[model samples]
Target: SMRILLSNDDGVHAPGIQTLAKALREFADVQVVAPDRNRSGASNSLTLESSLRTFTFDNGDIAVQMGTPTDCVYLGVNALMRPRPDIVVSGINAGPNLGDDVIYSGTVAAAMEGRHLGFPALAVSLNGYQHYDTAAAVTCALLRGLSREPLRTGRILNVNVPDLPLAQVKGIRVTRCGSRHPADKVIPQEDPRGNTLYWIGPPGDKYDAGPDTDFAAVDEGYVSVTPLHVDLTAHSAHDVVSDWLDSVGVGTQW
Candidate 1:
């Protein structure tokens, strides 16, 4: 009887969303909403200046948002869904969103929005392109098991499954986010109109995959599940900053 708001950055018609929708059907009342086209790497952004629009499918199983992943969730939760959703599940993205990749991932951004709005959410992805369906199955299994547990407030679950058959998987590992390789520069090109244009180059070398990290687990053929919290505030710096403020007589100004 749980209502789940499901969405992704790969657009409303992507195979990953369809697969997840079908897989999650057995566990919860699922509603799907997503961008009209692939909006990869579109971090936690919202369309504020432009007017938003949506088109609902005949079966009521899907809704298309002509906006970013964050926009889809904003609309779906506030306007589309009835009785609201208990949790938000974003993505079974085409590529892995591990480590620093989460900063640029629209999939993670969508779930981050849910976490920001005070909801338990999850962002999931597959490690490779060719064998995505295999990871999809594992994602389904994880969600099935997850439904029975109690999630602490102010947390989001990030999952990355390796591109292997479920049976070949080494099992699941709880991990921390890892780092990514440096990004290459944009390639300059001449447009047909003689205007100079540039395209982003291929992503740089990947960081060393290590144990207890999302990248490592996926590399070792295991599913990686990482719990993320929104508060980026370094509590350890509080006392240091407090002392500095006192030294600077910051409170005297007020």
Candidate 2:
């Protein structure tokens, strides 16, 4: 039987992951281990020093872990699910996670963790919270196709669906991750006692949303599939590193 470990940055009870999980059940035995509460922007952090707390109910159908997104995937595949899984699928996140947002997204981070552990992993996001079914359908279609082949190890398919109806959606495109300018305009607010607090500024300008970028694909109403590799070695910059180290003491312990 095909098995998929499902996890997300959203709380375990969030509608997005719930809908995706139900649809995925048609293609695989699903094990859902997710954070007990919303852990947005958690990235790939683990609750290593603090012992993780877990609860299982529905006879192991669902579990809540008091940890970050990556911790859920780590525990789910390594310690929770029996017999392991063919792959790990993360997200159906409520908001768009494009450009450099992947660096901060718990959704993408969770999938990356799975790939690091040698599973073909997929991270999914919807441009908006309300349009989940379309994302779910597209993900299922992609998974079905992937099922026909050996799961590619150490790779993640970071999928972002545009906020469009199925008919309105343009075709999927292979894209590169884009970049964002520094955000501006932090807003201030106060409680009844008049103590002030602040909120993050609006999303910054898209300086790198070129036609070949994920940001452009989503903006153009297409599904963006950015293949992510675990290795971040800068192959093209090897000479630069040599130049840098040569300027310093390489053979000497200066």
Candidate 3:
């Protein structure tokens, strides 16, 4: 009788989220609470500055939050789902969210919130626009595998599937996050109000695809599985900073 909570950044009605929810129903009871509208690039953001609201459906299967993806999961897990769910699944996002993109992905942010609340979570994405169903099938398979093994504490999986038919998929590969196209573009523009504005330019030059990297595996038509952790502390820097502190005589603070 395992229960699952499903959500995404592309709004509750997005095809991606619907596909994920439908696929997950085979493994567990699913509840969905997602943003009322698209909230792309809303990384780990909560609706702290404004009062949050929810619209629950009559069937009790879905709820739409007029907030960020993180807010939806936080509210859904704490206030909406009864008896609590065993895990949280986010995304099947319309685009690939790799490398540094995780910093801006609401899909990852929702999964992060789930991990923060002590639940096994997953954030999934398709590498291209066309074969989304292929990605969805891979995601369903991955979920089945995860349900069998489960994740260790303090870790979540970020999965990206190349947009290929299921039959064309090479296989699954556990990988590390890879570099992205260089992010050096900045565009200047004028707003409708006659004010000068700027937009970040398009993605950078593609990094050379290599073995053991998510980008490379996806390029080879493989489903890439990357384990992510919440702890971002630079442990290696502690001793270096401590040595600097001793050199500066700051270690003997009053």
Candidate 4:
């Protein structure tokens, strides 16, 4: 059996995480450590300056108050779980973390933190609110695959499940990250004291939603599995930069 460290950006008591816990518990050894409140869009931010504390439920799930999703996973892997987890699973998020969304997703960050510590990780989300069970089932199948033949790449998998019944899912597509237009305009408001406040607007429409992209897969009612690497290098730009450097009369240093 697999030992999974489960956490999420949607807080410990959110329906998505609770449902995933129940499903995962049937097969894997699941240990949950998550924020006490929603921390969506927390990105890869980790708490460093301030100390943190946790409260535990009777069922042994731990909740970290005022912490990011990354913090919860960090605590679980380094100090909480006794035998250490074979894998880390983050979310079954109530909404999608598809396309450009992963760049700012706390769900993805939790999985990234897990991979940083050397375990294969998965970040799972539902494309809509109605059917989390669909996403949960997808996660189980992925985990079973991992248990049999491990993913050899040094990357985490970001999965977005269509919000349909399990039988209705078209299929799973291994895809690449797609981009989106920039976010929508911010909304300004006036408080009772006449102070101005602003709210971040909704996400932008999809831009690079090609057939090979995550955006396309999810849009077509399929599960999208995008392998995300930690490295941010532009390896293909080497030749372009070299030519530019030569034109600028810059010599390479030995």
Q: Best by lDDT, which number? A: 4
- Position 182, candidate 2: lDDT: 86
What's model 1's lDDT at 162? 88
lDDT of 4 by residue, 1-254 (tens): 88899999999989999999999999989999999999999998889999999999999999998989999999999999989988899998989888878889999998987886445799999988989889999999998887778687856999999999998899989999999999978999999999999999888888999979998999899999999988878999999998999888789543
Compared with the true structure, all predictions reach lDDT values of 0.81, 0.85, 0.81, 0.90
Residue 176, candidate 1: Cα error in Å is 0.9
User: Across residues 1-254, which tens digit of lDDT does each residue of candidate 3 receive?
Assistant: 56778888988878888887777777689899899889988889887788887887765545555689999889878888888877788987988878767878899988877785445688988886677688778877766776577556445788898888889998889888777776888898999999989898777755745878888888888888888887778899999998888888895663
Off-target runs (Cα >4 Å) in candidate 1 are 62-64, 116-119, 234-254
Judging by TM-score, tell me the better candidate of 1 and 3: 3
Give the winner by TM-score: 2 or 3.
2
Residue-by-residue lDDT tens digits, candidate 2, 159-227: 999877888998999899999998788999998999999988777898899979999999999999998
Ranking by TM-score: 4, 2, 3, 1
Which residue ranges in model 3 land beyond 4 Å of their true spot? 57-63, 116-119, 206-209, 247-254
Better of 2 and 3 by lDDT: 2
Q: What is the TM-score of each predicted model, taking all chains together?
A: 0.86, 0.89, 0.88, 0.93
Please, what are the lDDT tens digits per residue for candidate 1 over residues 63-179?
555689988888778887887887788977988998887878899878876774434688889887656667667766655665667655436888898888777989989999888
RMSD of 4: 2.2
